[model samples]
Target: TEYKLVVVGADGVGKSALTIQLIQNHFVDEYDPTIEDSYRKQVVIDGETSLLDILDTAGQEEYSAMRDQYMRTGEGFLLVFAINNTKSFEDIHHYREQIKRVKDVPMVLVGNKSDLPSRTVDTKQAQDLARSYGIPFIETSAKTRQGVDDAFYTLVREIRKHKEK
Candidate 1:
């Protein structure tokens, strides 16, 4: 089976970190400010081989990236934001609302940059947001490798369950 997953967040929130960590098993520091860089990988999730086409997307508005066109293609989305960035955290509502209207798609809220020294968006705030969205929330440190795999794997599971509905 094949699953389409999208990683989205405000600029500098480590969207590339979480994604590259998954695909490459390491950390990458540079930010890619552009449209979308597509990636493909095959992995076993719960004993079944699944093909995943992951779209790493741009968050900044200046490029726009024709976001609406790709939103429809995603079966699941990973909504990311830096725990240290209050503004990026605030932007989650806009991202979530955009995805929700496209269709009843699966989503997981991710608080990235967990390896950092500060957390403006605390655990309670993150949990509350997910509760309001009726979705799961995870704190990830792409550098130290915390919850990176689980974040993506969780989306696969969400998509699988949503498919049944």
Candidate 2:
């Protein structure tokens, strides 16, 4: 199966930074890419090989049908936010509602920049929000590059199960 993931979140939450690590150390430090950019990685998860296409949005143009178009094609969403910014954390449901109203797809909630220390968000609060949405929440640091392989892969697995409905 092929997995198409749309990574959505507020700016500066390290979406592209995490995407580089998520690509198996394939990408280097880069500037913001527009919405037209797409990265494809062939990954084997649980011995199941599949084509993983990740759509990372940098600063880009905004229109009415832009996200709805890509979200339509996306099999799962990588909802990213910073642990330090509670506002970004709160905007998650806004992004989710955008997708939910437009389409019903699988998702994975991620707290990025885990290397930074902050008191605004907590491990418990993040997990609670994930459970509320019935989605998995994972903390990851792009600098150290952990928890990403599973973050995207776990979302991929969910799409496999939920898309059957």
Candidate 3:
């Protein structure tokens, strides 16, 4: 079976890096603006094998109009923000609202850049945001490959659970 997951967040929030780490198990140290990128990986959870189809989306305001199309194809979402950037954290609701406008699907809150020392958004704030939406919240450091797979795995499981309902 295959599931489509979309990575949504503001520009420079480590969405692309998180996707890269989850799929390739490597960190991308440089910043690159994503137009859109697709990747696939086979994952096993509890002896069940499934294909993960991931979409790494562009975060620029100019690409905002393209989000609806991506949202329509997504069965689950990774709503990401950089823990060091308060603006990115504050914009989490914006991304969720955009996704909800297109489809109501299972989603996760991801606070990226956990390895950075200059963290601005504390875990409590992120957890509160996630709690407001009744979704799981996780912190990830794509640079160090921490919590990357866990975030993706949790989101995939949530997507599967939603389908079973």
Candidate 4:
């Protein structure tokens, strides 16, 4: 079985930035706000033959209504948010609830933008949110390459486990 992921979040929350960094090992010190363009890529987990079809969906709230269709093709969701922005954190729940309405897929909460210390979101808040939702959580900084690989690989591991069952 192939594991598919559809990543969704609010604009400027590093959706594209995260996709670019994970798929290509590239980073930008800064990026223009992410717009309504979908980016798709295929990834192979290291030391495993499993393949992942990763889709990075555009994050404009205008596109939220269409997420149901995107989620149907995937086995899991990666709900990303910028750590410092309250709006992003809130929006993560919006996406989570919205996606669940379509199907009860497992979700991994990703709090991105960990490199900006001054703009960091509260760690306890993130932890609480994850615990409340019972989802695996991780903080990542694409610029430093910190937690990026682990973040994606953790999702892969979860997907593998689900497939095995």
Candidate 5:
């Protein structure tokens, strides 16, 4: 089976980094704005092989229309935010609300850049938001690859759960 996963978050929030690491197993250090990018990979989770079609979306006001289109295609979502950037953290709500407006799909809330030295968003706050949304929450470090696989797998499982229903 195939699943469409959308990565939504603010610019510089490491959405591309996390998606790249999940698909290519490599971390990119440079900060580059993503207009839009699609990646496909065959992954085995729990002995089941499935195709993951991931849309790495642009995170700017200029791309709202593009984002809405991509949001419509998603079967699952990865709502990302940089833990150190409070603005990005705050913007996650907007992304989450937009996703809900587009579709009632399964999603995971990801707090990226856990390896950064200074963090403005606390774990409790992220957890509270995730709890409110009734989704799993995780912190990831693309630099160290920490929690990257877990976050993606969690979303994948949620997608499968929704599909089974």
Candidate 6:
């Protein structure tokens, strides 16, 4: 059996970079923007294979209906937000609420680009928000590889653990 983990949130927040870093174990300084689709990677852990169906949704406040649909069937989610952008963090709650409307599953509130010093959203604020939602909080920098490697692995480990209960 495979689990579908969706990586979503506002665009250009290092979502694809995080995915690339995880799957490829490498990063690029510059790259093309994401199209109107997603990149899929089937990761094998131990003996189980989990498909990371990352939905590279567009930036802030776009297609609500389609986004909601993707959120419906997702088993777990990585709700990414840029540390250098406050609006991105603010929208995390909105996206999570939208997802909750369809499914009540495990989630990890990922504060991406932690390596950037021009942080618009404070780390404490994001941590508190995650605590309030009773979810895990992770700070990752896809550029510098700071805490980036643990985000998906930690979330998936938790998902597997919780599934037993």
Residue 15 displacement (Å), model 2 = 0.8
| Deviation (Å) of 14 in candidate 2 | 1.1
Task: Kindly provide the TM-score of model 6 when superposed on the true structure, using C-alpha atoms.
Answer: 0.82
lDDT of 2 by residue, 1-109 (tens): 7888988888777788878787767434554644335789998988999999998866663646766676778879999998889898988988888778777479999
lDDT of 4 by residue, 1-165 (tens): 466777778877777778778777899655556544445445567666655567777634554546666667777778899888889998887888877777736778889989887665798898899899887898998777788877777777777766678
- Candidate lDDT scores, in order, read 0.87, 0.82, 0.88, 0.75, 0.87, 0.77
lDDT of 6 by residue, 14-114 (tens): 77788778767788655456553456668766667877665555544555677667668777778999999888888898879877887737789999988
Stronger candidate by lDDT (4 vs 6): 6
Displacement of residue 61 (Cα, Å) in model 4 is: 3.4
Model 3 C-alpha lDDT per residue in residues 1-165, reported as the tens digit of each score: 898989989889998889888788888777468567889999997578989999998844653555567568899999999999999999989989888887747999999999999999999999999999999998899999888888998998999889889
lDDT per residue for candidate 1 within 1-165, as digits (tens), equals: 999999988888888878888888989877566656878889998998998888988745642346566677899999999999999999999888887766557999999989888878899999999998888998999999999988999999999999899
lDDT (C-alpha) at residue 67 in model 6:
65
Q: Per-prediction count of colliding residue pairs? A: 0, 0, 0, 0, 0, 0
Looking at candidate 3, what is the lDDT of residue 58? Answer: 83
Give the local distance difference test score of model 2. 0.82
lDDT of 5 by residue, 8-100 (tens): 898989888988998888998874685578899899988889898998888356546765676788988999999999999899889888888
Model 4 segments beyond 4 Å from truth?
A: 29-46, 59-67
Clashing pairs in 6: none
Error of 1 at 73 (Å): 0.6
Which model is ahead, 1 or 6, in terms of TM-score?
Answer: 1
What's the CA error at residue 18 for candidate 6, in Å? 1.2
